């Protein structure tokens, strides 16, 4: 039986402040520009619509000089960090930003077409762009958060898919790594294996995998290391209504319409999909640049950072202004305009600032306390006396071993904390 | 004289937590696809705009293992489950999804006499789509919830109905089953029998029946087994204004206008119908993933689950993103684009999770108490010592007989319940 | 000097509940369809944009069976009902509906016309529709609500009204009968007498009289029997901007523009009129299906229902979804589509439900008290020992004489009332 | 270790009110007009989207005669003004103001193009305009605020940016001078060096630098003189979706689409940029014309005005209506209209009013205090017994040396302050 951490992890009255420096990154918002091919280094794919997963690395509280190493007894107890406050700071101003496709699969406007439209010609693919759904979310945990998405099912012998026939869909659970794209309004699926056209969604998610946090599973997780802090705020609406070019896989039953003559003799495309649209983005509904206190967690883990680790999973689309930079091919910069003599670039900036307030905690290693932790996570006892199960995954590592401080008064969050406590 | 249950149903201090696993279903959002035609097994019609009616099957508390069978005396009392806490869980992300009809009966734009169209023929039906009205609701009871809808009234034998004339309308009460379509903004009626065109409404409600819960009737119900919990949240607006093609049944009174000449000599179509539209869909106005406690119900039944049953009626259209899947007809996936070589499919997902906190109750079987229950529902006494009156209707059965648990602590809803109780 | 009823109306502790059955009505939303033309019996005009004036008829408390006929001395005092609780119920789902006119007088779009427009020839009327302003309101009093509207009075013997000149506008107070049209955003006037064109507004108000409540007068009423309860909630915006065809009556002064040449030599039409539009209709700002307790009235009358009457004036435009009905000319229903073989019809439904909590009251008839009531309304004394000032006006009569009950516990509003009372 | 000012700055009970007169300025909203061209004296560039940085100059409280010069001991201590109240008054009415560019680089509409568009020939630049993002911000400090912006990185001596290639982006900190441009919704960058086209953004930020307050840095500031009061409110949305004319710098990876033929053989422009748009501007969300009290500042400086200075940094775009002026070339003003015989001018007005409530404060000059202020800012002690480190920057000097008064009662803010205190 799983037990609340407040029943074996005794807390102290010793609080530390820890803050990252300035986490900053720029790059192309649509795709990584590979190294060399003009200029040196490589420009990373940096979008407002991808998950930020910071792996916060903490100092080992046991091999760490204390303000007084008589807070505990190194013979019968161990130390753990317990997160008490977090403030994710966001840098750039509020802005909206578009994403698009040079050959988007848009047959024709079905919102209110002036009349009939084109026929099923070929390559009626147009160039369109669309601002995505607006999402803000923040997840804390001592383990990475689990996402879900839809992928092709399994290729069991029983019935070999007649090729052209629609595959079965399987919900797949996965870890949210840094760089994974969010649900933008086009559903959370694997577009690289479910859409052979590679033209049904905009460029940045076209060949990517859009995940969505598995809140249901993470809440039902027995120990609750996945999330002990969750903030979400999403909103969107439908801007334009369109068709899909191609033949209908599922045939519309004759019992659903009266047959006609000419073009209207047979039913056209009945696969509709609306362009997403996050509405007004305001400061009043902003989720960040505010401190949050983890009073008492939702799960059984109450902010205890096992393995001296901390995962901060962040999404903020309320800052998606993509910079437009253009240089001329000619050096003296000609006085006669000519679009071909200018190169257009597109860069996006992400600026973060993590701030924490940690609390020192003691665990009395009694016999059954140990065998409980044994069952929970044996590797916890090993470190207290190597391979990590996460080294295969892409994280934005933030070292804080050198960032802890005792005087909270000297830091913004530190003052806010002291105020809040009384 | 109907009596409050809190007068003959004594509540204990024993609480159980029960939960479904993960209720999940995928299918076509418009029409069920006949199996075998391409692939094995049928593709169910799964829409966001159809009632989910879960039939929760509880274990008989009398034939059930208690932590102590001295909670009551089996010689003069019986046990009932009373509902105390509920959490309906929703998995997939927020999103909008369109519905349409290849041959919608849209004459022309009456919103603002635009410009002209371009058609030969005389059949002017266009392929239009529309986002439905946005609706959220949740009904709890120990009996299925009652719906209303409009249908063709019985043609009287005295005065027959000459073909072409308008039928009289009759309001019809009925049981909401799992799969019944909701009010999408086109009203609540039998479209399969009040529209011979089969083109007045989009495809998924085309040959169906849209039902609205009869809240007035269920509130007026004497005992109140129909609903002891009701949450509703709806909103919509008029997007586009349109005309209907066809001859006018009711002739516009000559005295409501001045005759013109040419086309304007006689009045055109005067049957207008607007395309519905739920505006912004936000998380801030969400109704689900939040727990709700049944403190004191609206009706005379106070969460008492007679027949050890529970009917959870749910509508949530705030998650209606329809996936678009496409496979190529060629195996190597050609490097030249051609719309004819790609089969477009449309799939929708419905992920649920049901959580309950049930409370053990006792009923002392006295003379008048039994005679009371006799008149209320004789079948109740029968089971305490077979055919079920609902065995004709479609329900999503959720068996919770192996899902009851005494330690609320171990479960998400359980913890919240304990907190709320103090 | 008028006195507050609370000084001469003593209240008891006896409360009754009374509710109508289910007030229901269907018909054409634009105009009544003269009987027998295609089918037996008239089809009433039933629109969402017309007042609903229920005349509730209460039993005479004196000639009424009491739980104990010693609540008063029938020699020295009489009894009066005094309203304490009200709940108007609405049945149909939330919807938006359109109104139009086959020959709407719309010259041309003036919002942002592409350039110049058509010649002011003769007949350019277009078939346009429009969703009206969104209005909810509810009035209670023991006397019908008063409304105001604009009509052309009379030409006095002195000056004449030249054929073609603009008539003088006179504000006219009047009783709101059931069926009267509300302000739809085209102002509150008599379109049948002020507009000879009969094409300036949509069809249902084309020849009607739109009335608005004269709140200003009803609050200034000495006794305040006209309203002791008043709820209102309206909203709208301007959808499209248009011109009016015809010659200008008031000539635009030369000192307000510079003359041009060609068509721009003389100014065109300067009679602008926007099409109204109620925006998002939501359940969140709904006014009905909720109980309201008349704690202390605004006027002098404190819910005292003189003459055992009660007037309930209601407007609800948040439920205006008009049902589209179409039958075919052919019996076997042809498989080939042809709009001419389908008669279209338009039907609106209005479903209500009135519930009340009434409080029995006592008036001790002393010298001055009788002389006061004499001056207030002599006909009150007469009934305590014949015509009525209204029997010329159309009301929706709801007889609740057989609907009074003593046990509030048996009814929804009753329970709600008990809870509220503590 | 930095210390809160409240530990070495003892406040008195003396309160002064000071107010500027009517700060007022008119000018061209897009660019400054060189003098003598058509009329004497220059026409300054006054825009609603540029920072207002007031450098308020306080009277030296030491060389100041007091209501009583025994508040302190001029031998052992010094006087300092501490701010306690601020009210920034705005004059002109609320309004929306546009900005544009005669040759805006807009290829074509990618929101929902009718289909394909024009050839990427040479000059397709159209005259477009756009209302900016809606920003309100107010910052107080005894040192000017810090802004950030993106500028052309410092050329690699060992990687010369080959002409045409994309330059490296460097985030640059800077003092916010009066006149600096704010983020309008096109990002905060140096358009004069990052966009050679000189046609990517509207005219008023075409050759300027858009700065955004570095809130992160100013909060991490050790002493916190830069801001001890910060009020922000910003909102916007995406109005129209546009392409960029020019050649693509970063080439779209071939594995992201399927090649076509004709114009759709090669991908088009994939640099999208939405026109910004602040939505409804209402008085309900207004940030000015209200008084604000600095109870306890965020940083370590609690409103202490060192050097008897004050830096008010104000941004307000809710008042951007640009007056349209036009005179005729002809003196008698012609009776025939001709657009050529009229000169169109554009002017914008900015009206301010600064009101303050200052508190007298003492500093007992001891050893450690002096050597702290020594470390904090030596120049503070130097004035107590020259060159200013901000004499290079453009500020709006507000002299208040002759505006301080003791009777708060006689002033608006004065009264409100008295009331608020009790």
């Amino acid at each position: 039986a799983v037990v609340n951490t407040d029943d074996y992890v005794t807390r102290t009255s010793i609080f530390y402040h820890a803050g990252s420096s300035r986490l900053l990154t720029v790059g192309d918002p649509y795709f990584r520009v590979p190294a060399g091919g003009g200029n040196k280094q490589d420009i990373p794919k940096v979008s407002a619509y991808q998950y930020r997963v910071f792996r916060v690395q903490l100092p080992d509280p046991n091999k760490f000089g204390l303000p007084d190493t008589s807070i505990y007894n190194p013979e019968t107890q161990r130390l753990v960090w317990a997160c008490a406050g977090v403030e994710i700071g966001r840098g750039q101003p509020l802005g909206v930003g578009l994403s698009g496709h040079p050959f988007y699969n848009k047959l024709d406007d079905t919102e209110s077409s002036h009349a009939a439209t084109s026929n099923v010609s070929e390559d009626v693919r147009d160039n369109v762009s669309v601002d995505y759904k607006q999402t803000q979310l923040c997840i804390l945990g001592c383990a990475p958060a689990i996402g879900e998405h839809w992928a092709k099912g399994t290729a069991s012998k029983s019935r070999p898919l007649s090729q052209g026939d629609c595959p079965p869909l399987e919900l797949k659970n996965t870890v949210l790594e840094d760089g994974d794209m969010v649900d933008t309004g086009y559903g959370a699926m694997d577009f690289s294996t479910l859409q052979d056209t590679k033209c049904e969604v905009p460029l940045d998610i076209c060949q990517s995998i859009c995940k969505y946090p598995d809140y249901l599973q993470m809440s039902a997780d027995p120990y609750g290391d996945s999330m002990f802090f969750c903030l979400r705020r999403e909103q969107l609406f439908a801007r334009h209504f369109w068709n899909r070019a191609g033949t209908m896989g599922d045939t519309v039953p004759q019992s659903l319409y009266i047959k006609g003559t000419g073009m209207r003799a047979s039913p056209g495309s009945c696969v509709y999909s609306p362009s997403p649209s996050g509405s007004i983005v305001t400061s009043d509904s902003q989720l960040f640049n505010k401190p949050y206190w983890l009073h008492k967690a939702q799960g059984h883990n109450n902010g205890v950072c096992w393995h001296n680790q901390l995962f901060v999973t962040v999404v903020d689309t309320t800052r998606s202004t993509n910079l437009t930079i253009c240089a001329s091919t000619q050096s003296p910069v000609p006085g006669q305009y000519d679009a071909t003599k200018f190169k257009q670039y597109s860069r996006h900036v992400e600026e973060y600032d993590l701030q924490f307030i940690f609390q020192l905690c003691t665990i009395t290693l009694t016999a059954d306390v140990m065998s409980y932790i044994q069952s929970m996570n044996s590797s916890i006892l090993e470190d207290w006396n190597n391979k990590d199960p996460y080294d295969k995954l892409k994280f934005w590592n933030v070292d804080l071993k050198e960032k802890f401080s005792l005087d909270l008064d000297q830091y913004p969050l530190g003052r806010k904390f002291l105020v809040q406590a009384g």
Side-chain angles (χ1 to χ4, degrees), chain A:
Chain A
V2 192
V3 189
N4 210 279
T5 62
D6 308 325
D7 287 18
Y8 58 100
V9 180
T10 321
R11 302 172 174 262
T12 70
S13 48
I14 288 83
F15 294 97
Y16 284 82
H17 173 282
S20 78
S21 53
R22 177 190 252 165
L23 307 168
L24 182 57
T25 190
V26 310
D28 188 285
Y30 301 154
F31 50 86
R32 66 151 27 206
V33 196
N39 121 110
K40 199 224 137 216
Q41 254 306 0
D42 37 53
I43 348 281
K45 173 179 159 199
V46 181
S47 172
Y49 302 101
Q50 51 186 17
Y51 289 91
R52 298 265 81 94
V53 180
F54 304 102
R55 183 180 184 171
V56 171
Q57 192 69 48
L58 296 185
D60 189 322
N62 306 286
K63 309 178 181 187
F64 180 67
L66 292 181
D68 158 53
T69 319
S70 71
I71 308 305
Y72 80 133
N73 161 45
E75 302 291 318
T76 63
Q77 45 206 177
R78 289 295 183 267
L79 293 173
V80 185
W81 289 120
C83 185
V86 179
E87 184 171 59
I88 303 115
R90 301 284 283 116
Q92 296 308 275
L94 264 59
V96 293
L98 306 179
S99 316
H101 201 301
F103 306 117
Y104 189 86
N105 184 23
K106 179 204 72 178
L107 190 53
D108 34 49
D109 179 81
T110 67
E111 183 174 359
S112 61
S113 56
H114 229 288
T117 58
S118 84
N119 51 86
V120 268
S121 2
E122 308 75 19
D123 221 23
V124 213
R125 302 182 299 176
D126 295 315
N127 187 309
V128 314
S129 61
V130 48
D131 67 315
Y132 286 142
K133 152 189 171 184
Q134 172 198 155
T135 315
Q136 313 177 64
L137 82 94
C138 161
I139 310 299
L140 293 167
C142 58
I146 305 105
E148 63 183 2
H149 77 277
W150 290 97
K152 240 199 225 143
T154 232
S156 94
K157 44 185 111 180
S158 290
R159 174 63 90 97
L161 246 44
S162 90
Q163 177 34 274
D165 271 57
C166 179
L169 292 317
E170 185 184 56
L171 191 65
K172 277 189 171 181
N173 277 312
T174 167
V175 172
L176 290 164
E177 327 164 57
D178 172 79
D180 289 327
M181 308 288 292
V182 298
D183 171 75
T184 56
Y186 282 96
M189 45 179 266
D190 183 13
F191 301 93
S192 66
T193 57
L194 248 49
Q195 299 178 337
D196 296 30
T197 319
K198 301 166 67 166
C199 292
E200 314 290 308
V201 289
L203 237 42
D204 47 46
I205 59 172
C206 170
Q207 287 291 90
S208 301
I209 308 152
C210 293
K211 306 174 183 180
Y212 189 69
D214 197 336
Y215 299 107
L216 283 183
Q217 164 142 11
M218 276 185 294
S219 304
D221 180 73
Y223 290 103
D225 295 330
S226 294
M227 59 151 54
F228 47 64
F229 188 81
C230 169
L231 259 61
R232 77 167 84 88
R233 184 154 302 165
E234 39 194 305
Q235 70 153 43
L236 72 315
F237 76 101
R239 179 79 86 96
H240 288 91
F241 310 157
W242 290 319
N243 246 165
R244 293 294 198 195
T247 80
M248 299 291 95
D250 297 322
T251 324
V252 187
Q254 272 281 85
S255 54
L256 285 178
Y257 59 97
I258 316 301
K259 199 99 80 54
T261 306
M263 63 174 295
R264 272 174 277 270
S266 184
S269 180
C270 327
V271 189
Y272 316 93
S273 66
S275 62
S277 196
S279 190
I280 303 164
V281 41
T282 172
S283 55
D284 307 325
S285 62
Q286 194 70 203
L287 220 66
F288 303 108
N289 293 133
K290 307 163 51 183
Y292 295 96
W293 323 110
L294 336 176
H295 51 298
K296 288 154 186 173
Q298 60 91 191
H300 274 124
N301 186 313
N302 205 329
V304 175
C305 311
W306 301 113
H307 285 82
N308 313 313
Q309 266 191 163
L310 199 58
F311 289 86
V312 185
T313 307
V314 171
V315 174
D316 177 53
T317 77
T318 60
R319 291 179 167 80
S320 57
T321 10
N322 297 150
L323 302 188
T324 297
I325 296 96
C326 59
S328 50
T329 306
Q330 326 293 314
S331 182
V333 187
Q336 174 83 283
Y337 173 78
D338 186 12
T340 68
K341 313 183 87 180
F342 287 87
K343 286 197 166 181
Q344 225 74 33
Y345 295 85
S346 210
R347 295 306 148 89
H348 181 223
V349 177
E350 216 69 4
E351 179 181 344
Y352 282 88
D353 165 87
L354 309 179
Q355 301 182 56
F356 304 87
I357 292 292
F358 287 110
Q359 185 173 21
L360 194 64
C361 294
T362 63
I363 282 76
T364 303
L365 279 186
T366 92
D368 53 1
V369 169
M370 242 168 293
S371 47
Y372 172 87
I373 301 179
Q374 194 74 89
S375 312
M376 178 174 63
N377 183 205
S378 51
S379 48
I380 301 185
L381 286 180
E382 284 179 275
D383 289 12
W384 291 343
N385 297 313
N386 292 318
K387 253 59 179 177
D388 164 72
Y390 305 138
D391 295 329
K392 298 284 98 188
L393 310 157
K394 297 289 180 181
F395 298 127
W396 186 337
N397 309 284
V398 175
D399 187 282
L400 293 198
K401 297 169 175 172
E402 322 298 337
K403 304 283 197 159
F404 277 51
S405 181
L406 269 174
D407 44 13
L408 306 189
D409 187 37
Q410 299 296 133
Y411 302 90
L413 220 199
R415 310 180 200 110
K416 291 179 189 171
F417 177 83
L418 301 166
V419 167
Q420 171 260 20

